[PDB]
Write an enzyme that holds these catalytic residues in place. Structure first.
Site, mmCIF file in Angstrom:
data_model
loop_
_atom_site.group_PDB
_atom_site.id
_atom_site.type_symbol
_atom_site.label_atom_id
_atom_site.label_comp_id
_atom_site.label_asym_id
_atom_site.label_seq_id
_atom_site.Cartn_x
_atom_site.Cartn_y
_atom_site.Cartn_z
ATOM 1 N N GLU A 86 14.601 -25.454 39.379
ATOM 2 C CA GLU A 86 13.155 -25.503 39.209
ATOM 3 C C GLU A 86 12.469 -24.933 40.449
ATOM 4 O OE1 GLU A 86 11.391 -29.019 37.342
ATOM 5 O OE2 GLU A 86 9.902 -29.044 38.950
ATOM 6 N N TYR A 137 32.172 -39.426 32.086
ATOM 7 C CA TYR A 137 30.801 -39.827 31.797
ATOM 8 C C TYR A 137 30.682 -41.347 31.667
ATOM 9 C CZ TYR A 137 26.083 -38.589 30.150
ATOM 10 O OH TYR A 137 24.722 -38.409 30.029
ATOM 11 N N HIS A 161 22.624 -42.821 33.648
ATOM 12 C CA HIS A 161 21.266 -42.313 33.849
ATOM 13 C C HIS A 161 20.443 -43.231 34.749
ATOM 14 C CE1 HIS A 161 22.421 -40.295 30.021
ATOM 15 N NE2 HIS A 161 21.789 -39.280 30.582
ATOM 16 N N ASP A 208 24.267 -47.649 28.566
ATOM 17 C CA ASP A 208 24.124 -46.341 29.194
ATOM 18 C C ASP A 208 25.455 -45.936 29.829
ATOM 19 O OD1 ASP A 208 22.742 -44.005 29.930
ATOM 20 O OD2 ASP A 208 22.219 -44.828 31.893
ATOM 21 N N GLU A 256 25.515 -37.311 36.336
ATOM 22 C CA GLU A 256 24.101 -37.229 35.997
ATOM 23 C C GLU A 256 23.272 -36.758 37.183
ATOM 24 O OE1 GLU A 256 22.182 -37.368 33.419
ATOM 25 O OE2 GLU A 256 23.922 -37.536 32.098
ATOM 26 N N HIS A 285 25.958 -29.755 33.537
ATOM 27 C CA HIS A 285 27.030 -30.575 32.977
ATOM 28 C C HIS A 285 28.235 -29.709 32.651
ATOM 29 C CE1 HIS A 285 25.244 -34.471 32.892
ATOM 30 N NE2 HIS A 285 24.264 -34.140 32.062
ATOM 31 N N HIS A 325 19.627 -28.902 33.998
ATOM 32 C CA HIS A 325 20.327 -30.180 33.997
ATOM 33 C C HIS A 325 21.520 -30.139 33.045
ATOM 34 C CE1 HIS A 325 20.622 -34.700 33.862
ATOM 35 N NE2 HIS A 325 21.099 -34.404 32.666
ATOM 36 N N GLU A 326 21.284 -29.675 31.822
ATOM 37 C CA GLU A 326 22.316 -29.687 30.791
ATOM 38 C C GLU A 326 23.400 -28.646 31.041
ATOM 39 O OE1 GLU A 326 22.357 -32.123 28.994
ATOM 40 O OE2 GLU A 326 20.271 -32.803 28.983
HETATM 41 CA CA CA Z 1 11.019 -31.301 37.605
HETATM 42 CA CA CA Z 2 7.759 -29.247 37.841
HETATM 43 ZN ZN ZN Z 3 22.734 -35.382 31.884
#
Ligand code: CA
Ligand code: CA
Ligand code: ZN
Ligand code: CA
Ligand code: CA
Length: 314
Positions: free
Chosen positions: A177, A157, A229, A224, A166, A146, A142-143
């Site tokens: 994953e 953002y 998010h 936010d 996001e 970015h 995820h990061e």
């Molecule tokens: Ca997951």
């Molecule tokens: Ca998982």
């Molecule tokens: Zn993020």
């Protein structure tokens, strides 16, 4: 920094044993020379000053609890690099094998991780809301996504463009994953060690945790940064529908799988999205991406259309 490439061994946040690429020079450093200009992992030592010190180890074994976040940060950064390289022919986040730097043990009881514009930063969590966020492969991906976004689309953002930013990170976070026990949830591995079966966000059902699953339900306040998010749940839901299919608010969507999802959204990210793109422009970018790849009459274009229709994005 200049040393002999080698392979160490250690345990991650979830207690799983893993091999990790290190560099030997007096100490064994968490420096992966096999991936681009290198992947570097630092110790912030519970401080906020970054990056800290390049993680040095005496025996190339990382079985200490204090080593765990560094092991997973170092390792999952490698997996995420492999993903973009092998699946999308992209070399690191800038496309030219930029050095991937990560810092762990950031601050004290810090329940968050982030890309600060130059590197990864992971808190250890307070041990109740979060355990060290490096443990989540979807968090790590995820990061780093970015970084990919900042170097391509450049989605600011804030508001809907930030929501897309996001969402992109959640989507590719999930695809990594799946690339590496996968699911369409976010941060379940590191979130709330006391309670089982929950997570930070759900792509399959965003409303589970109060995030909108339809455009009519979008957050429009100021917090936010305009709900980056929060409103991401709208796009995450569309992404889920494109891949897995299903009927949402009476609108039926035919799934086309995760691989075609990735190809479409990646192309949208790198070819059509701009810093100020909103959901509607994302929709159009995705429709055109699928059109480039599969044709204007293909089921892949139809599924993308049905998906954004389902979440109420014209
Ligand atoms: Ca997951
Ligand atoms: Ca998982
Ligand atoms: Zn993020
Ligand atoms: Ca050691
Ligand atoms: Ca939990």
């Amino acid at each position: 920094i200049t040393g002999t490439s080698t392979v160490g061994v250690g345990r991650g946040v979830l207690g799983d044993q893993k091999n990790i690429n290190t560099t030997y020079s007096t100490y064994y450093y968490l420096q992966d020379n096999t991936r681009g200009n290198g992947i570097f992992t630092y110790d912030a030592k519970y401080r906020t000053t970054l990056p800290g010190s390049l993680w040095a180890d005496a025996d190339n074994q990382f079985f200490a609890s204090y080593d765990a976040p560094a092991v997973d940060a170092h390792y999952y950064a490698g997996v995420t690099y492999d993903y973009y390289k092998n699946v999308h022919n992209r070399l690191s986040y800038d496309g030219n094998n930029a050095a991937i730097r990560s810092s762990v043990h950031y601050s004290q009881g810090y329940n968050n991780a982030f890309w600060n514009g130059s590197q990864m930063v992971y808190g250890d969590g307070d041990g109740q809301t979060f355990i060290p966020l490096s443990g989540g492969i979807d968090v790590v991906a995820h990061e780093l996504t970015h970084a990919v976004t900042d170097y391509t689309a450049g989605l600011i953002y804030q508001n809907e463009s930030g929501a897309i930013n996001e969402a992109i990170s959640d989507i590719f976070g999930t695809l990594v994953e799946f690339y590496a026990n996968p699911d369409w949830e976010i941060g379940e591995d590191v979130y709330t060690p006391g309670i089982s079966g929950d997570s930070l966000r759900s792509m399959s059902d965003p409303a589970k945790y109060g995030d909108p699953d339809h455009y009519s339900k979008r957050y429009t306040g100021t917090q936010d940064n305009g709900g980056v998010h929060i409103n991401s749940g709208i796009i995450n839901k569309a992404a889920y529908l494109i891949s897995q299919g299903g009927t949402h608010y009476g609108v039926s969507v035919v799934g086309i799988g995760r691989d075609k999802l990735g190809k479409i959204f990646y192309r949208a990210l790198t070819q059509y999205l701009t810093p100020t793109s909103n959901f509607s422009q994302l929709r159009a970018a995705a429709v055109q991406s699928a059109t480039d790849l599969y044709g204007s009459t293909s089921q892949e274009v139809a599924s993308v259309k049905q998906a954004f229709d389902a979440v109420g994005v014209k």
